[PDB]
Design a protein around this motif. Structure first.
Motif, short mmCIF file in Angstrom:
data_model
loop_
_atom_site.label_atom_id
_atom_site.label_comp_id
_atom_site.label_asym_id
_atom_site.label_seq_id
_atom_site.Cartn_x
_atom_site.Cartn_y
_atom_site.Cartn_z
N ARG A 1 0.76 -1.21 0.12
CA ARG A 1 -0.03 -0.03 -0.07
C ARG A 1 1.03 1.38 0.11
NH1 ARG A 1 -3.98 -2.98 3.47
NH2 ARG A 1 -2.76 -2.12 5.57
N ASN A 2 0.64 2.26 -0.72
CA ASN A 2 1.26 3.62 -0.91
C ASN A 2 1.12 4.48 0.71
OD1 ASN A 2 0.83 2.96 -3.55
ND2 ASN A 2 -0.79 4.53 -3.88
N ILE A 3 2.42 4.89 0.91
CA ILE A 3 2.53 5.59 1.94
C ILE A 3 2.61 7.14 1.36
CG2 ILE A 3 3.29 3.86 3.49
CD1 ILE A 3 6.25 5.07 3.00
N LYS A 4 2.57 8.15 2.32
CA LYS A 4 2.88 9.44 1.70
C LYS A 4 4.24 9.60 2.01
CE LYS A 4 -1.32 11.28 3.85
NZ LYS A 4 -2.74 10.96 3.47
N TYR A 5 5.05 9.19 0.97
CA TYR A 5 6.55 9.34 0.94
C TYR A 5 6.88 10.62 0.44
CZ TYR A 5 11.46 7.87 0.46
OH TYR A 5 12.91 8.01 0.46
N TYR A 6 7.85 11.38 1.22
CA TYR A 6 8.45 12.63 0.72
C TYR A 6 9.86 12.86 1.47
CZ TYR A 6 7.75 15.01 4.99
OH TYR A 6 7.49 15.59 6.33
N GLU A 7 10.80 13.55 0.76
CA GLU A 7 11.96 13.90 1.22
C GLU A 7 12.27 15.32 1.48
OE1 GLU A 7 14.22 10.17 -0.86
OE2 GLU A 7 15.29 12.06 -0.80
N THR A 8 12.84 15.83 2.59
CA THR A 8 13.11 17.22 2.76
C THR A 8 14.34 17.59 2.22
OG1 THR A 8 11.43 16.91 4.49
CG2 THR A 8 12.88 19.00 4.59
N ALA A 9 14.35 19.00 1.57
CA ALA A 9 15.58 19.37 1.15
C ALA A 9 15.95 20.40 2.03
CB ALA A 9 15.33 19.89 -0.37
N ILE A 10 17.37 20.40 2.55
CA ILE A 10 18.10 21.31 3.42
C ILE A 10 19.38 21.49 2.84
CG2 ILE A 10 16.35 21.11 5.37
CD1 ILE A 10 18.86 19.12 6.45
N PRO A 11 20.02 22.69 2.84
CA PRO A 11 21.41 22.84 2.61
C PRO A 11 22.32 22.09 3.62
CG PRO A 11 20.74 24.89 3.72
CD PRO A 11 19.46 24.02 3.35
N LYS A 12 23.59 21.68 3.02
CA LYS A 12 24.43 21.28 3.90
C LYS A 12 24.60 22.10 4.95
CE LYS A 12 28.54 19.15 2.58
NZ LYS A 12 30.02 19.31 1.91
N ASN A 13 24.89 21.50 6.15
CA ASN A 13 25.42 22.20 7.34
C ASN A 13 24.19 22.93 8.04
OD1 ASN A 13 28.15 21.21 6.96
ND2 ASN A 13 28.35 23.10 5.83
N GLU A 14 22.83 22.86 7.87
CA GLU A 14 21.78 23.52 8.60
C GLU A 14 21.30 22.58 9.88
OE1 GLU A 14 17.15 23.96 7.90
OE2 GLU A 14 18.35 22.21 8.32
N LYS A 15 20.61 23.21 10.63
CA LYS A 15 20.12 22.63 11.92
C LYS A 15 19.67 21.15 11.80
N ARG A 16 19.02 20.76 10.72
CA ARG A 16 18.49 19.42 10.38
C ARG A 16 19.41 18.56 9.49
NH1 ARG A 16 12.64 21.82 8.73
NH2 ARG A 16 14.19 22.94 7.55
N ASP A 17 20.87 19.10 9.49
CA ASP A 17 21.53 18.05 8.94
C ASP A 17 22.22 17.21 9.89
OD1 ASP A 17 23.51 16.92 7.07
OD2 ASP A 17 24.74 18.61 6.79
N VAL A 18 21.80 16.25 10.16
CA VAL A 18 22.02 15.24 11.37
C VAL A 18 22.12 14.08 10.92
CG1 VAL A 18 21.66 14.80 13.85
CG2 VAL A 18 20.65 16.69 12.75
N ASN A 19 23.23 13.25 11.46
CA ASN A 19 23.50 11.84 11.22
C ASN A 19 22.56 11.01 11.94
OD1 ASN A 19 25.38 12.75 9.04
ND2 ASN A 19 27.02 12.97 10.52
N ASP A 20 21.82 9.90 11.28
CA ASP A 20 21.11 9.03 12.14
C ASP A 20 22.09 8.08 12.98
OD1 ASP A 20 18.57 10.02 11.35
OD2 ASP A 20 18.11 8.45 10.19
N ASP A 21 23.07 7.78 12.41
CA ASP A 21 23.80 6.68 12.66
C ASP A 21 25.46 7.09 12.80
N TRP A 22 26.22 6.66 14.02
CA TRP A 22 27.57 7.04 14.04
C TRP A 22 28.36 7.04 12.90
CZ3 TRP A 22 31.96 4.41 12.96
CH2 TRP A 22 33.17 4.68 13.60
N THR A 23 29.28 8.10 12.78
CA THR A 23 30.12 8.37 11.60
C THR A 23 31.57 7.98 11.86
OG1 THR A 23 28.64 10.13 11.54
CG2 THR A 23 30.27 9.90 9.78
N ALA A 24 32.28 7.45 10.84
CA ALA A 24 33.85 7.15 11.00
C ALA A 24 34.61 8.26 11.04
CB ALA A 24 34.15 6.19 9.72
#
Length: 644
Positions: free
Chosen positions: A232-255
């Motif tokens: 079944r369809n979900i309401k899929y969308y992605e949000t666009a933000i510039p690099k290094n904005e408040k919402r530019d956060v990594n879900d997972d730990w980074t090397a």
């Protein structure tokens, strides 16, 4: 003579297939003349031509004329499942996108680069001129953000060689892990919550972050898993933000911070509830547990990677490494590309998740994207950098495409790659090692093959891929190997990178001592080969020994930081007697070119260390071999351990 001109034009030709009914001529054969191009559809650097006593420049103009005829030859229906976004439109669009629908702007919805005061003042205290350091983590204004969208994202899907993806699947069948076929199942909430950043960003229409959704809206995530599982369809969308904005956060730990550095200029990410739904189900593939992508170095720490690679490098007779360097990779992922990864995921997943993977993939081939400011565009394929599948999906897609390109260029068959090359990938980044003749064939002919595969390589000198003839010319993860000498008569390699850059990254952040000591230890694990950085690290770690390091960055320590180091590096900091003289000269060059240091800086930093280390006590600065040599005092470590 005109051969380089043809080679430039053939990279802009639309990819075609093999034509057995005509004469297929290369850039060389066209430059010699008496060959007349009949069409511009390119296949392995060759196009179909009638042998008709031509002149070289005349053949070139017909081939350019055909390429422009083809280029000057369309708007696309929106999918039903994406229709919901049009009802949220409130104002007319102003993205001025030329290749993807800019249906308008939804109603509006409800960070700066600063110094790390303690790390920054230690640098000033030695005469490092911060203002001369390169700028890092630059955020961009709305205007240049929309220009970045038009520049990179507003584009028709890449054309690829006909049948490319059947071939790539043929490559996957040479590298699959059949003992895992149809075994992957979802994970429990406990295991998911272990490896996740609770501050994972919310999407445009969301308010809670990962952790808050975990705490209070699990049923909303499960409803989403259920809808996808039933097709079944979900309401899929992605949000666009510039690099290094408040919402530019990594879900997972980074090397390392190198993974923020390689992010696109435009971050595009699913909702937090949706990133959670994907991950709970596709966990074992998106987090590579186990690792089924050959050469995938996503879980290798930055201080181990080059020691790992040297062992392979040494087993060759005359080794070279050829770099993978795709322009704006995420923008070059096609619908067929994502569907190739869909078929591979369905190989490893139990059948009760195929309808799930099918529907998500369908949602990902035409994606409503909402900008910070509210502007919507409908993206055709490509990869959004914030999707859970970015690392695993791009890594496989990279490996497959590169083995295919190497195999088609050298004549080595897909099943024989593992016998003549070693490959290493981290998303779109990577390289392979192979013998020198094989590598030079791949580096010259691979440019055209990769353009026909829809992954164009960054333009270079002589239309060739970058070859490393000596080990420490390899480039991977923004770093490059540098050798150190230990006091036990061994040598090993560390992740090296420009000193100006390390100083920049260490001295700044986007919006206290516990955090800075974490950063210092984090950099000390990577950069102890660099005496300037190593000493700035020990001075900061010397600060306020009663305060324990924070946990918001790559690494931190429990107990003693010198012992924590010993635990992951395999020697004591004090045992590092020499850093490669030549490579260090190369990585310090920009210090002098930018004038970030003077003739006094190293001595003043050493002197400030000696002054602290000569005094009575137990001082971290004396874990530095040269400082301890000048102070006559040593550091006696306590128990200590490194953590993520």
């Amino acid at each position: 003579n005109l051969t380089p001109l043809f080679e430039e034009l053939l990279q802009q030709c639309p990819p075609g297939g093999q034509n057995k009914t005509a004469h297929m001529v290369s850039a060389y054969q066209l430059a010699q003349g008496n060959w007349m191009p009949t069409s511009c559809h390119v296949f392995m650097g060759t196009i179909s031509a009638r042998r008709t006593k031509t002149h070289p420049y005349e053949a070139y103009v017909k081939l350019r004329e055909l390429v422009e005829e083809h280029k000057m030859k369309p708007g696309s229906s929106l999918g039903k499942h994406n229709d919901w976004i049009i009802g949220k439109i409130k104002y007319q669009g102003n993205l001025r996108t030329k290749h993807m629908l800019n249906p308008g702007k939804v109603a509006e919805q409800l960070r700066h680069n600063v110094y790390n005061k303690t790390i920054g003042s230690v640098m000033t205290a030695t005469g490092i001129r911060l203002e001369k350091l390169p700028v890092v983590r630059a955020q961009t204004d709305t205007t240049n953000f929309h220009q970045a969208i038009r520049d990179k994202i507003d584009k028709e899907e890449n054309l690829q060689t006909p049948g490319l993806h059947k071939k790539l699947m043929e490559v996957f069948n040479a590298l699959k892990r059949p003992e895992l076929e149809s075994s992957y199942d979802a994970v429990e909430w406990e295991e998911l919550e272990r490896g996740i950043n609770r501050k994972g960003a919310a999407g445009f229409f969301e308010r809670k972050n990962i952790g808050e959704i975990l705490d209070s809206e699990k049923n909303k995530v499960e409803e989403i898993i259920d809808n996808l599982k039933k097709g079944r369809n979900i309401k899929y969308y992605e949000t666009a933000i510039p690099k290094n904005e408040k919402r530019d956060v990594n879900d997972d730990w980074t090397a390392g911070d190198f993974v923020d550095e390689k992010k696109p200029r435009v971050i595009q990410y699913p909702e937090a509830k949706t990133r959670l739904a994907i991950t709970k189900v596709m966990y074992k593939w998106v987090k590579q547990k186990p690792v089924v992508i050959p050469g995938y170095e996503g879980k290798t720490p930055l201080f181990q990677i080059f020691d790992k690679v040297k062992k392979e490098w040494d087993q060759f007779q005359n080794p070279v490494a050829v770099s993978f360097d795709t322009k704006a990779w995420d923008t070059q992922v096609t619908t067929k590309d994502l569907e190739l990864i869909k078929d591979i995921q369905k190989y490893y997943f139990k059948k009760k998740w195929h309808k799930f993977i099918d529907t998500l993939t369908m949602h990902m081939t035409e994606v409503p994207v909402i900008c910070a400011d509210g502007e919507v565009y409908i993206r055709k394929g490509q990869r959004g950098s914030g999707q859970p599948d970015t690392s695993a999906g791009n890594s496989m897609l990279n490996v497959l495409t590169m083995v295919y390109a190497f195999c088609e260029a050298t004549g080595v068959p897909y099943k024989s790659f593992d016998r003549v090359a070693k490959i290493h990938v981290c998303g779109d980044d990577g390289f392979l090692i192979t013998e020198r003749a094989l590598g030079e064939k791949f580096a010259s002919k691979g440019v055209q093959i990769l353009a026909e595969a829809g992954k164009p390589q960054k333009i270079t000198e002589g239309d060739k891929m970058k070859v490393a003839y000596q080990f420490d010319d390899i480039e991977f993860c923004s770093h490059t190997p540098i050798q150190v000498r230990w006091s036990d008569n061994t040598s090993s390699y560390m992740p090296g990178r420009n000193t100006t850059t390390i100083l920049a990254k260490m001295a700044t952040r986007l919006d206290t001592i516990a955090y800075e000591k974490a950063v210092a230890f984090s950099f000390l694990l990577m950069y102890s080969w660099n005496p300037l950085i190593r000493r700035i690290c020990l001075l900061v770690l010397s600060t306020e020994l009663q305060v324990k390091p924070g946990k918001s960055t790559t690494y931190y320590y429990e107990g003693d930081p010198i012992s924590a180091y010993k635990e992951v590096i395999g020697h004591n900091l004090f045992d590092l007697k020499r850093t490669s003289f030549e490579k260090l000269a190369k990585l310090n060059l920009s210090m002098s070119v930018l004038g970030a240091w003077t003739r006094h800086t190293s001595k003043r930093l050493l002197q400030d260390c000696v002054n602290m280390g000569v005094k009575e006590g137990n001082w971290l600065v004396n874990a530095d071999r040269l400082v301890s040599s000048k102070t006559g005092n040593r550091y006696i470590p306590g128990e200590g351990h490194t953590l993520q």
